[PDB]
């Protein structure tokens, strides 16, 4: 348990004391909620105490006689939201019980108080979802009506009301819940809410959706009124735009008005009584019936040409007899019609009828009547969709009749908004568009955005004809004449909060500024400053910034900027009274410095700091209104100002932590709320100033480090301000080369963050942010973790993952649990013991035993060393006793009274913890091996099924934990998926989604476990075939077509997209779309396509169904429904690129080329076409755009386009500039399409090319063209980038001159700006670099241009696709010696070097794959051309610091990208041979192989990106090898990464090609490399991977050549032919051979044959124990280890000379025998290798010391045991060693018999002393105790040898070793002989 | 000392877990009691973020006797050498509103809701402490 603050116990008192006297009441109250808020770290713990004092008595007293005030009910919410938190997550019954019993009761009296404040009800509304969790929700009815009162309260915010209409929503499914309701105030009060205090905005339309949500199940129990009909059809009027709404009102409608109501009307209808009667009647009743669109089909079977009739016959002639009456009449048909235009079908029966016509003609009478108007023009807008309609329509000149209208009428609301939206449908279409341009044009538009500014609707259509239109403007008069700038200036300026509007209206200001006399008109600065505004107002927003600058960029001038900088300082000291004056000059100063060009203006008159100034005099005074808004603008103007700057920031940064530590701040805050305050603004801006890494020196830094510690000191309990502190420590940590570390070693930061990290350990967001910085920190100096450890950073460490099952984190704290990891033998020793405490658990049947350990493991498991420790400590096979224990004891569990957890709730609870285990062991590769082993995936079946009966409280999290550890397993090993896979474990998975029906985490797993089996065609169809999974389809479609919950909607989307992606089979797709996927699925799309979540997860669904299903079957084969659903949402949704993206991808798969006539009608080549250009950059964007007009004829297309330009450049128009410029937007999108027959579609390239060329040189400077020339040349390279014979790409650009002109107009430094041109034009340089036939013209043309390639890099430093373009042009243009030379001496500059400004703009990018990636193959690219063509090593590389920086860029969450890019590069530095040292000291190759590793546990990524991971991290180990760096490698098992590929990736051709080619090269490389080839790989290649040798060119190839390195040396080839499987791969190459003949056969034949004869030829001669000394004993006079582990060539070696020696030791040998001299040797061989540590396990697991020993008895020659003694001598250096001999028993007697026999001998006096000093050697080493040698002569030999040498027999040297070993046998027991 | 921003040390040390070693450098709160000898220097210690700490350390500590006298020792310093007589106060605020006169006369509103509250107001006040 944790502790509760003290000061509860006292707040409580005060409340309890206090009860019936309120002023003080209140003050305890308000004091306890605070307590319990988390704000407080311990407001849980504080929850509970104030429970446990009984403090709840006190609050329902309170509450029932203090209902009104309002802060009682805000206070008492909150202590008990706070209770309701706590009791979730501790689940004890009893506090769950009382919270139920006691708890409740206020919540619901606080709800029937009818609150409108949205804390109290957030609470109250948070409590009743928490208590549902727990298991003792509140019930609905209790709280429903009380909930509705809220809404006869006014000022309701919509946010906290669309939270109660859901809250009502849920209430009404029961018939209880609807009955209450209606015995309160029924629908009206909520309906009634909407109509009048309901928005349009995101929230209102949620708030509305539920409000019919809860109408419709009302409806369902007959407890509506009669006021609902009426009324939600006017909520449905007042909605209709919106689809989600409409849609939800028809539902509820269509539960209130059954069929028989619709039959009755129509027939009554079709018994005429035409004339009042009950035909007119009937016939308003019609018009409701309407409203309901599941009766529309209905309706147009029998009727909807009647409304014509009403409308045309029975209106259009009596219009002038009967005006009002008529009017009325008119209006209802066309809505009418409007509203029944649901269906293609349905407009296709208006069109039969003339509709049009009839329509268009009433128009021309309904001059006057607006409402008949706008009726009519509503009406019209479904059939103007249609392209064919549209011209009928101008026929009818009713545009040319409704405009004008519009303008003279725009004030009135009804007309503006239809007439608008007509006009807006109409722009879509070029015939109509000239039209309207001609009659008054949108001079009149532009003018009507003056109006209804607050109609995002009428705004935005307005907006998007105008951007529809202005394109096609010659002059901009009229416009002006009309006053239409001065309109959406107006727009703009009135919509500060629609994001939406707002963007709209400054592309629309910047389209204007795109026509020539637009200056004339546009520098008023009115414009300019709306712009400025507008920009400062809506920072967050790139699209609207981007295209104000360009704005900006075209009508500002610096006439503008001293207009502004000349009454800066007076502004700022007239501050306090008018704020907006300095506002404005602040946004204008902000916005005109992101103008390369302007910003000079201000540097000079060094604005920044002037604002500087201003802002520390706007907070050390007296407070005034306006105060907050001025300073947090000046934070955003200085910023910004830094940021498009280019100075160092370190003044500006700590100026800023000086502004924040003034000491006013805290005041000045306090009015405002704790996360959008002055402290925060500043703490954002510093953190965005750090990102750009421009902090370099190491005082300046200090100063930094400094200023961010003051300010987190300051401030302790402004949270979002501590965030961005964190967050900018990181930025600091890793900068000037990443030194920052030590700067916060030294100032102590690092044990700030630990102790942060300590105080506040609920604030994840604070926990990642935080352990962030240190873990960055951690990778960039070593002995950081000391000073962790030292503070203790373990202690946070453990809370962090034990308060956050959650992943990020953990992730992050990885690199430190590895770091501080404990001793690592502290886990290991707690594991093993918590294993043996389980194991007794069962063995003892204590279940809570088991309970409680299992938990304690848990909590070292979430390691990545844990898990890794407990699969080698056996847990797996542990894992099988642990369940089998639970299964069968589980009533023993029910029984338990005495512990925490009692009731089902401990068994389930148990299995959950050890399914828990499981899980997280197998977050390892290791891990999984294991648990796989050990039967553990049965294990785990048997688990879940154990979970049964009453759901518990662990029930779910115990099924979770099963089937996520279920899945892991699955997916990581197909064989063990496959022999899961059994009908019965199926039935047993669908039904665990019925038992937990709400659970989507269950939901999720089960699904990925079921489509991880599915892993083939007839597995497939045999889990079709299951009738639970047929169910289980049925049951997720119908989540998807009528839950009301989005997140239902999206997960079992996400359910279904799993089945049929993991699956990938047409047979799964097919079950899926038959249980009616495919019409839900669009369903969703055409009800939500406003909704980016829903949209984008519908069509991701749609599109992988659409590869294997023709989605019109689903629709009659009419593509028209699927069609305008998707072009509509398109429409929606086309500033979201990833919706764009999964869109495009769905029409690609609806729609055929003999769909065009269709896709001209429904507009969808338009909106494709406009997608492209909002998404140039976007890859798949463009793509998929491609093949959509790939189906409209590109190869006729582009032929055709091509010859119209050539053509108009030859005739001189005057128009010829824009005329080709259009032309080239158009030929750019086709140029995306594949082709079919490229040579005929492409075939006028150079012609046109030649044609462009001229065309730019006669017209300089103009913009738009200059991006569209560009554009066309990019689509022309990216087509054929590779394919150097390709005569329609590189190769016309360059051979047509384009290449050169693109290179003069840089040199020029004229387009220096136009980003649009730059791009591509890099993007084309790239391309005439890769074409190695274009590549000396690049060479001729750079040094022009070069320079100011610098200078483009410093201008746009800020754009990241202009950097990764120039980036990717010098990577692939240093492909080229000389090109490199031109690189390094041609820029230079402020940032620095060519290698430095890389550096700097990735670290400014660091979060761009594309700046990051083509940074890093750039300096790859360099660094290696460079060291081929003479040049000396870039010296930024070899001294570290890159590397370094480079390491930096990578994060935990890296994309397989960028970790490709690093290995690339890193593989070029390896095959460069220059940069060895560096890469060493960096460990290079071990932090990839690190990486690597990490990814193979976790599995983050794909298959197909981890086999390509493998495939380059080969590449690398070649490099590696061709660099000599091996056995830096066999310090990390580098050789290990090779085997793993082969292992997992065995059946992939291109990881094995690369695996057989670094095989060769390591092993030429390093005799011990080839060794682990042999006898590891080479198995492993023959089985595994068999199947790719034999079937692969390029495998089989490589295999053959690897061989051929490996038998051309003595030995390899005979262990090479016991390899099994050998000999199938090489016949299997033998007969790829035959099947390719030509050249490559023949070679690979004689390959095969070559390697066979090798093998036959190898004929080593029998080797001698003396060779293995020979080799040995030359490998330590050279200084190479002998370490057995270490050496490969050893093994062999070593175990040679255990079993040649063994075979020797039986026989009684002689020094003079061949083989007893060889014994000698063998011997000596011994003892060299006994002279390392390393080898002595293996030594003593042969019975070394035995042995040897034996061979001291036994043999006879005191020459052979000689050899034996000097070996053992040696071996017993070493502590533990000589222990072992020791301890065997006989050693001291018998080593001491040896001294005996020599002392005893006649050999010659010489020969006696070498013997002696060996025996005395041993002795000295084996007598590890002074008493070991008691029992023994060895005092008397020892003495003996003395008295010979006395008698001159023996040199000094004898006597040293007698003395040594009398001191160490010395004892009691030989001081007689002494 | 100052020069040497030695408060940032002093503001740190005593936020700490407790812990009879530690409860030990929290009697290090005495160290800043003894340097605070002026209400230059007890603004100093404010601007370090010494109220907003010797405020977390008051409230953590009902529990913890010899810190809880060492902190309030601290702060009731801190205040003594902020807060002025009630009289001088006094006589701020009717000179402020003097002011106020004066100007009318010549051309009555009220004194700058700021400038009156921190004329009134003794050192808690002035060094930024709040109602709750």
């Known amino acids: ?1874 | 000392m100052m020069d040497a921003d030695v408060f940032s040390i002093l503001v740190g040390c005593v936020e700490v877990d407790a812990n009879e070693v530690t409860d030990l450098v929290v009697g290090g709160l005495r160290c800043t009691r003894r340097i605070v000898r002026s209400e230059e220097l007890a603004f100093e210690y404010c601007n370090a973020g010494g109220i907003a700490t010797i405020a977390n350390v008051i409230c953590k500590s009902i529990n913890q006797p010899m810190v809880m006298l060492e902190a309030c020792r601290v702060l009731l310093g801190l205040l003594f050498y902020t807060t002025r007589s009630q009289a001088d106060r006094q006589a701020a605020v009717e000179a402020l509103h003097a002011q106020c006169q004066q100007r009318a006369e010549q051309m009555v509103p009220e004194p700058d809701p700021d400038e009156l509250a921190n004329a009134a107001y003794g050192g808690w006040y002035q060094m930024g402490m709040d109602e709750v």
């Open chain 1, 1 to 1874: 348990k944790r502790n509760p603050d003290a000061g509860v116990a006292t707040a409580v008192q005060s409340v309890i004391q206090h009860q019936t006297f309120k002023r003080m009441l209140l003050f305890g109250l308000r004091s306890l909620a605070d307590f319990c808020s988390p704000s407080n770290q311990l407001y849980q713990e504080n929850a509970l105490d104030a429970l446990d004092r009984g403090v709840l008595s006190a609050i329902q007293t309170a509450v029932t006689t203090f209902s009104d005030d309002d802060d009682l009910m805000l206070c008492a919410s909150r202590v008990l939201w706070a209770m309701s938190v706590a009791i979730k997550e501790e689940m004890d019954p009893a506090h769950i019980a009382r919270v139920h019993s006691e708890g409740s009761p206020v919540i619901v009296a606080v709800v029937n108080s009818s609150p409108t404040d949205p804390q109290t009800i957030e609470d109250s509304m948070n409590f009743v979802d928490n208590l549902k969790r727990a298991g003792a929700p509140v019930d609905g009815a209790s709280l429903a009506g009380g909930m509705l009162s809220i809404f006869t309260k006014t000022a309701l915010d919509m946010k906290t009301a669309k939270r109660v209409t859901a809250a009502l929503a849920i209430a009404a499914e029961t018939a209880e819940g609807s009955t209450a309701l209606y015995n309160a105030g029924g629908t009206s009060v909520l309906l009634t809410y909407c109509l009048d205090q309901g928005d349009l905005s995101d929230a209102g339309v949620e708030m509305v959706e539920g409000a019919f949500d809860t109408v419709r199940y009302m409806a369902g129990y007959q407890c509506t009124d009669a006021t609902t009909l009426p009324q939600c059809i006017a909520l449905m009027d007042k909605y209709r735009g919106r689809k989600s709404a409409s849609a939800k009102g028809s539902s509820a409608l269509a539960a209130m008005i059954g069929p028989e109501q619709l039959q009755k009307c129509l027939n009554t209808l079709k018994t005429a009584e035409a004339g009042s009667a009950e035909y007119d009647e009937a016939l308003v009743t019609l018009g409701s019936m309407s409203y309901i669109s599941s009766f529309t089909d209905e309706i147009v079977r029998a009727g909807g040409v009647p409304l014509l009739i009403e409308l045309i016959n029975s209106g259009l002639p009596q219009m002038e007899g009967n005006p009002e009456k008529i009017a009325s009449m008119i209006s209802g048909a066309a809505k009418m019609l409007a509203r029944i235009a649901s269906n293609p079908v349905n407009v296709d029966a208006i069109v039969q009828a003339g509709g049009v016509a009839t329509l268009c003609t009433a128009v021309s009478y309904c001059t006057e009547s607006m409402e008949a108007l706008g009726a009519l023009c509503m009406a019209l807008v479904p059939l103007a969709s249609r392209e064919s309609l549209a011209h009928e329509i101008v026929q009818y000149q009713t545009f040319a009749t409704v405009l004008p209208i519009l303008y003279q009428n725009v004030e009135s609301p009804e007309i503006a908004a239809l007439a608008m939206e007509l006009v807006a449908t109409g722009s879509q279409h070029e015939e109509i568009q000239e039209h309207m341009l001609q009659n008054q044009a949108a001079e009149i538009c532009s003018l009507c955005c003056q109006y209804h500014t607050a109609d995002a609707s009428y705004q935005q259509h307005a907006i998007s004809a105008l951007n529809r239109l202005v394109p096609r403007l010659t002059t901009l008069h009229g416009v002006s004449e009309y006053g239409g700038i001065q309109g959406v200036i107006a727009s703009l300026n009135a919509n500060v909060n629609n994001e939406q509007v707002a963007l709209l209206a400054v592309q629309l200001l910047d389209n204007f500024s795109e026509v020539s006399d637009a200056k004339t008109y546009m520098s008023d600065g009115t414009c300019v400053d709306a712009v400025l505004a507008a920009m400062l107002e809506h920072e967050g927003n790139d699209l609207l910034i981007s295209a104000g600058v360009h704005c900006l960029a075209r009508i500002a001038t610096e006439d503008d900027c001293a207009r502004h900088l000349n009454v800066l300082d007076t502004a700022i000291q007239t501050a306090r009274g008018n704020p907006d004056g300095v506002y404005r000059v602040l946004a204008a100063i902000s916005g005109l410095s992101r103008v390369p060009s302007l910003r000079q203006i201000f540097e000079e008159k060094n604005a920044s700091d002037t604002i500087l100034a201003g802002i520390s005099s706007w907070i050390e005074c007296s407070r005034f209104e306006g105060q907050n808004r001025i300073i947090k603008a000046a934070l955003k103007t200085v910023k910004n100002m830094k940021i498009s700057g280019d100075g160092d920031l370190t003044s500006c940064f700590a100026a800023m932590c000086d502004v924040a530590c003034l000491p006013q701040v805290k005041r000045v805050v306090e009015l405002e709320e704790p996360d959008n305050n002055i402290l925060v603004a500043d703490t954002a801006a510093f953190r965005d100033l750090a990102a750009t890494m421009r902090i370099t020196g190491a005082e300046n830094l200090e100063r930094c480090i400094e200023s961010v510690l003051r300010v987190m000191r300051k401030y302790p309990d402004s949270r979002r301000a501590q965030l961005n502190c964190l967050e900018t420590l990181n930025y600091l940590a890793q900068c000037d080369g990443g030194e920052g570390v030590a700067i916060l070693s030294r100032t102590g930061g690092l044990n700030a963050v630990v102790q942060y990290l300590t105080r506040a350990p609920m604030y994840l967001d604070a926990q990642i942010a935080g352990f962030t910085v240190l873990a960055t920190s951690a990778k960039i100096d070593s002995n950081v973790g000391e000073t962790l450890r030292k503070c203790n950073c373990l202690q946070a460490l453990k809370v962090a993952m034990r308060t956050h099952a959650k992943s990020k984190e953990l992730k992050r704290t990885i690199a430190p649990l590895v770091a501080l990891l404990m001793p690592t033998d502290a886990l290991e020793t707690e594991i093993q013991e918590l294993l043996n405490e389980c194991a007794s658990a069962c063995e003892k049947n204590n279940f809570p035993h088991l309970h409680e350990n299992l938990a304690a493991l848990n909590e070292l498991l979430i390691s990545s060393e844990g898990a890794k420790i407990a699969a080698r400590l056996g847990i797996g096979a542990h894992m099988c006793k642990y369940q089998e224990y639970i299964s069968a004891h589980e009533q023993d569990a029910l029984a338990v009274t005495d512990y925490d957890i009692l009731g089902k709730d401990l068994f389930d609870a148990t299995v959950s913890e050890c399914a828990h285990a499981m899980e997280q062991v197998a977050s390892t590769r290791s891990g999984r091996n294991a648990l796989i082993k050990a039967g553990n995936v049965a294990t785990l079946i048997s688990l879940y099924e154990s979970l049964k009966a009453p759901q518990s409280q662990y029930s779910e999290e115990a099924a979770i934990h099963c089937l996520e550890a279920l899945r892991i397993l699955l997916k990581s090993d197909k064989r063990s998926a496959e022999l899961a896979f059994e009908r019965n474990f199926v039935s047993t998975l669908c039904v665990g989604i019925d038992s937990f029906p709400h659970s989507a985490p269950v939901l999720g797993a089960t699904c990925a476990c079921l489509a991880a089996m599915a892993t083939t065609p007839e597995r497939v169809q045999m889990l079709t075939a299951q009738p639970a999974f047929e169910s289980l389809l049925q049951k997720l479609v119908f989540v998807i077509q009528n839950d009301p919950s989005k997140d239902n909607k999206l997960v079992a989307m996400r359910a279904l997209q799993e089945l049929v992606e993991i699956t990938n089979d047409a047979t799964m797709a097919n079950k899926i779309a038959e249980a009616g996927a495919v019409t839900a699925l669009f369903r969703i799309i055409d009800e939500y396509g406003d909704d980016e979540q829903l949209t984008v997860q519908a069509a991701e669904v749609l599109a992988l169904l659409g590869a294997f299903e023709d989605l019109r079957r689903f629709y009659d084969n009419d593509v028209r429904f699927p069609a305008q659903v998707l072009t509509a949402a398109l429409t929606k949704q086309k500033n979201n690129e990833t919706a764009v993206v999964h869109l495009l991808d769905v029409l690609n798969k609806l729609a055929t080329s003999e769909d065009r006539a269709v896709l001209r009608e429904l507009g969808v080549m338009e909106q494709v076409a406009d997608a492209m250009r909002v998404h140039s950059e976007s890859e798949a964007v463009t793509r998929l755009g491609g093949e959509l007009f790939a189906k409209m004829g590109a190869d006729e297309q582009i032929k055709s386009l091509m010859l119209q330009i050539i053509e108009t450049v030859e005739s001189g128009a005057e128009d010829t500039a824009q005329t080709v410029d259009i032309l080239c937007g158009r030929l750019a999108v086709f140029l995306a399409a594949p082709l079919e027959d490229p040579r005929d579609a492409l075939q006028h390239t150079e012609k046109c090319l030649g044609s462009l060329v001229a065309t730019l040189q006669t017209y300089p400077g103009s913009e738009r063209l200059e991006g569209n020339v560009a554009l066309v040349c990019r689509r022309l390279c990216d087509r054929c980038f590779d394919d150097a014979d390709d005569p329609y790409g590189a190769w016309a650009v360059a051979a047509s001159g384009m290449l050169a002109q693109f290179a003069g107009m840089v040199a020029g430094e004229t387009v220096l700006a136009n980003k649009k041109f730059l791009g591509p034009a890099y993007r084309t340089f790239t391309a005439c670099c890769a074409n190695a036939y274009c590549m000396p013209t690049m060479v001729e043309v750079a040094p022009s241009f070069l320079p100011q390639t610098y200078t483009l890099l410093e201008m746009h430093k800020n754009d990241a696709e202009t950097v990764a373009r120039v980036l990717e042009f010098l990577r692939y243009f240093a492909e080229d010696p000389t090109a490199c030379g031109l690189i390094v001496q041609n820029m230079s500059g402020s940032s620095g070097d060519v290698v430095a400004l890389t550096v700097l703009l990735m670290q400014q990018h660091q979060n761009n794959d594309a700046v990051v990636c083509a940074g890093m193959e750039f300096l790859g690219a360099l660094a290696y051309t460079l060291s081929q063509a003479g040049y000396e090593p870039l010296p930024t590389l070899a001294d570290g610091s890159v590397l370094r920086d480079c390491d930096a860029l990578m994060g935990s969450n890296s994309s397989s990208a960028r970790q490709l890019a690093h290995m690339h590069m890193i593989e070029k530095m390896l095959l460069s041979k220059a940069y060895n040292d560096a890469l060493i000291q960096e460990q290079a190759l071990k932090k990839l192989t690190m990486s690597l590793k990490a990814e193979d546990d976790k599995k983050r990524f794909s298959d197909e990106e981890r086999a390509g991971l493998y495939a380059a991290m080969a590449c690398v180990l070649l490099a590696a090898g061709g660099a000599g760096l091996t056995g830096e490698m066999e310090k990390f098992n580098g050789f290990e990464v090779v085997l793993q590929a082969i292992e997992e990736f065995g059946e992939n051709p291109t990881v094995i090609k690369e695996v057989n080619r670094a095989l060769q090269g390591l092993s030429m490389a390093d005799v011990n490399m080839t060794a682990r080839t042999v006898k590891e790989a080479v198995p492993k290649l023959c089985t595994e991977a068999t199947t790719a040798i034999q079937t692969d060119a390029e495998c089989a190839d490589t295999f053959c050549d690897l061989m051929l390195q490996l038998v051309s040396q003595e030995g390899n080839g005979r262990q090479l032919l016991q390899v099994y499987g050998l000999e199938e791969t090489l016949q299997g190459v033998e007969n790829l051979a035959a099947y390719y003949g030509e050249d490559f056969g023949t070679q690979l034949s004689e390959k095969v044959a070559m390697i066979r004869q090798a093998m036959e030829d190898d004929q080593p001669r029998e080797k001698t124990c003396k060779d293995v000394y020979d080799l040995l004993n030359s490998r330590v006079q050279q200084g190479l280890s002998v370490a057995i582990s270490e050496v490969a060539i050893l093994q062999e070696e070593v175990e040679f000379l255990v079993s040649q020696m063994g075979m020797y030791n039986q026989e009684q040998l002689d020094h003079q025998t061949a083989m007893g001299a060889d014994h000698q040797y063998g011997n000596m061989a011994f003892e060299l290798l006994a002279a390392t540590s390393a080898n002595v396990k293996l030594l003593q697991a042969n019975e070394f010391s035995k042995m040897e020993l034996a061979l001291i008895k036994g043999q006879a020659d005191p020459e052979i045991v000689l050899y034996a003694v000097k070996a053992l001598t040696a071996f017993c250096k070493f502590p533990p060693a000589a222990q072992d001999t020791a301890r065997i028993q006989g050693c001291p007697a018998l080593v001491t018999e040896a001294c005996s026999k020599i002392n005893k001998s006649g050999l010659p006096n010489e020969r006696k002393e070498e013997h002696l000093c060996a025996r005395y050697f041993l002795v000295e080493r084996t007598a590890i105790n002074r008493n070991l040698y008691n029992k023994t002569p060895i005092m008397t030999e020892l003495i003996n040898s003395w008295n010979d040498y006395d008698k001159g027999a023996y040199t000094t040297t004898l006597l040293r070793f007698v003395f040594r070993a009398m001191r160490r046998v010395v004892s009691d027991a030989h001081v007689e002989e002494l």
